[PDB]
Amino acid sequence: SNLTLNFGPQHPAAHGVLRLVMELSGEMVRKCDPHIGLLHRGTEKLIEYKTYLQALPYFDRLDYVSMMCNEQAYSLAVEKLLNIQPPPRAQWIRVLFGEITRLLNHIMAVTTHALDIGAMTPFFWMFEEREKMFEFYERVSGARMHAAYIRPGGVHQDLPLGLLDDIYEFSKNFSFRIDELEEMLTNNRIWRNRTVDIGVVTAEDALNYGFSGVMLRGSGIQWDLRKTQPYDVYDQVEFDVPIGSRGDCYDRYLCRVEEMRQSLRIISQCLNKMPPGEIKVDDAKVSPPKRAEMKTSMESLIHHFKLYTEGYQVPPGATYTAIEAPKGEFGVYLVSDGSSRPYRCKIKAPGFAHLAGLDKMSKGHMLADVVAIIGTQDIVFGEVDR
Amino acid sequence: TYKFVNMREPSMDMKSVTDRAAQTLLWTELVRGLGMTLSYLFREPATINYPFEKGPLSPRFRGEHALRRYPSGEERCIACKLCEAVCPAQAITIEAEPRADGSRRTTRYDIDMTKCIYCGFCQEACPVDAIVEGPNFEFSTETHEELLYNKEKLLNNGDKWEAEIAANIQADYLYR
Amino acid sequence: ASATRVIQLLRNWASGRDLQAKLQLRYQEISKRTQPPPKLPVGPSHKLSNNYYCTRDGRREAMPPSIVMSSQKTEKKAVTPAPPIKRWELSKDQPYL
């Protein structure tokens, strides 16, 4: 018989709480059985017991490496069901912070992938940059990661007077850090030996297994939701979509590095083209009024009271809204029954489908190869378990 | 628009072939990696000297909760229960009654800090700036019970941290 | 940074690039921690007249979905859900990495 092994949950390479039951012949991997739910918190029922504003912070904690992207997806779904439109400055801020969030996520993914394979230094080099982006998060919202900044009306608050200068200062130097990481990894023969031709997946299999994002693009599929189905102002920025040709771990790593460079490009464009104006929709039956107006005028106080006690009502109907989150397609199926509380909120996490394909990807590989394949799928279990 | 990441072809002349042979047999790229690590060795580290040095924060930072007063010393809170209604974690418990002088004040204001998510929705909902998230983040305890705050603890926090809370509110209220 | 010029040369030779130009540590080029107060413009619905809410009510313009082919109730060219997607172009900036 084969040897049965528990890989995780208490394992450095398990990416949190994951019970990988492996059947092994020697160190050859005969079967992978991922057991999840060790971080299932029942988010969707809890959301069923909240108003639309009260449910927003749950999306921060779904994928706790890309917070504002989940906030953006949920806000877009609620906006679609509300038949309202965010103001242009809010949309530009949304895209800027989405690209910053993509930078954060890609740093985490690449550095922890290298850490699992056995390279520890780039993690330390890039987490200082992560800390600076956390400072940007805190200066805009008061929290380092769980901002709750992007809301179905736009954004909570406008930028502080000196934020754009500091973002520009960080962006003009991040490319050298990317270059140093590349010098450490890209041409190293040990890295290539550990990554090239590992976890190969064909384009047809990737499509049928429900993959998205880099897990498609590494196999040559020319798909990107920001280019084919743009949402906020992504039709007004210029960038390239990196495409792989081998469908292995190495090509996906190259794609993620190139996507970081393209994110720097988009951030530059967003910094140059930030427009003036209000930062939430000028409709007090949706977005709360300013504090000065709330303490001065009767209607403003009434609407503030009602929006913070009962919340705004959403017309009945169901939507499926998806965005190109840093880990792939992130979606929300939101159903409204006409009241201030959602009837149903199904969350679609790309990591769910990506982990469901782990057994297919590990055929004919070893234990360390499976560790690399786990790293290459970019899995966070907050979104997988929900 | 798209670009390829791994679609190049090496040169097959004697010069390039010998260069690749030298790279294979003499470990050039590994030496480059060693040089990068040696370069990082001689840089100044990014470590700060905690607790003598502190990490940078902004006036918007959300930390330990506090209840505030008017300059006369009268409490700002008038027990409207908007913070209780809006709290996403149901971390706030409020009971109120008419005071001896007829004022609308609370007899119970509890925050479970082990339920709270520190989202700051209560301070946005409050119409009189009574409940705030302060700047303090160093308040770890040795027991679970010390983190179940009552009204006396929150009023003490307000009296303790008002000197910084008022200045922080002064710097950001024009954005609110 | 405070490194001596010999250490700067050693760093630049080891890394292969001029490190003093782009330092990880930020010294004095960041914004001041004290800023002047803002002003924050208002928005498009802050008019004094010609501003009835019924003319700018997005929620009230939502309606139930349009019904096509309820079961209870020739030329006929075939159709697609949308026109076929147009092939992507190859990166005039940098086509190959």
Partner: peptide, 29 residues
């Protein structure tokens, strides 16, 4: 009733930002 003051890019624009890969050859034959 002074002029609107908001966080905006400076007059003109910000300086160009590098994003492309930069790995010099840096070696003998």
């Amino acid at each position: 009733a002074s002029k609107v003051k908001q966080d905006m890019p400076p007059p003109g624009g910000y300086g160009p930002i590098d994003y492309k890969r930069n790995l010099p050859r840096r070696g003998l034959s």
